[PDB]
Design a protein around this nucleic acid. Structure first.
Lengths: 77, 76, 77, 76
DNA sequence: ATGTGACTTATAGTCCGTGTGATTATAGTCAACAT
DNA sequence: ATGTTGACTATAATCACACGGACTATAAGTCACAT
């Protein structure tokens, strides 16, 4: 569907595994539904900047380093 | 409101201006509503990635250039 | 399958709803997985007395009270 | 160990005796292993409902009578 | 008769994830009128 | 030109649940040898 979305959803998962988190921890720490974290990674889903922020806080990661990894993923072949 | 959401909006407005675009024209170029655009720039909207993407295409700016800018703006 | 199991299964759910609990709450307080609580209610799984005991403690109900409702459900038409 | 588990077992042993059965015979009647039964009666086993059901069949006691008894036993 | 121990094998119970209908909050989109 | 106020309607986001596969702990079932 959307170019950027699958990149965002890819990076959320990448970080989540890097930090040895599971989906449902992240769902807690991000103060969003269990199934939403799944749905974001699983398919992609069209999240909101506010929701993205919540997830970033949950990944225990800064806006900045998130976007830095986002850029790197976009740039790949 | 949100810090990120504010910086996003600021960035959208910044790029629109360094390109000498009007809102009217930013909305024409991305096929969204001008009041919608207005709203974002006065930070009254919490856009989705999809929408953000349409706005980048309307600004004629790559995802990467946008985020490069968004990062810099984020750091005061 | 087993006669007693689906009865035990039924009564666990009945109580759980009577107390306005959700599976999530229950598996919570029973310190079992929410998958297992679901599994039990769903497909009448074959639990252990120890696990049943945990569920009773989770339902905030006593041995006695449970077995009294168990007897009732068995007796029904 | 568990409180319930001990009284299940106690009950199983109680009924086997009130009937005049040996373990050997409770095992035969319920098509289970004798050491299996001995284990339960010394309370070294944590039955599943299914197993309990087989032991009730062997004792020839309905679920209801078993639980009526277990309750009474439970209340000291 | 019953009670051990110790040793496989079935399965109970765990852990992480997928996929889904139904409801609620809210973004997406477009009016009217402002300046 | 841009701002703001309601609106309607799509959909983001929530909530309670089912379902699967893979792995770990342990109950199920059977030996040998006590007594």
């Amino acid at each position: 569907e959307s170019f950027l979305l699958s990149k965002v959803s890819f990076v959320i998962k990448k970080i989540r595994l890097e930090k040895g988190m599971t989906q449902e921890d992240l769902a807690y720490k991000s103060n969003l539904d269990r199934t939403y974290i799944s749905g974001i990674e699983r398919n992609s889903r069209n999240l909101t900047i506010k929701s993205l922020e919540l997830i970033m806080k949950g990944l225990e990661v800064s806006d900045v380093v998130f976007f830095e990894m986002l850029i790197k993923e976009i740039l790949k072949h």
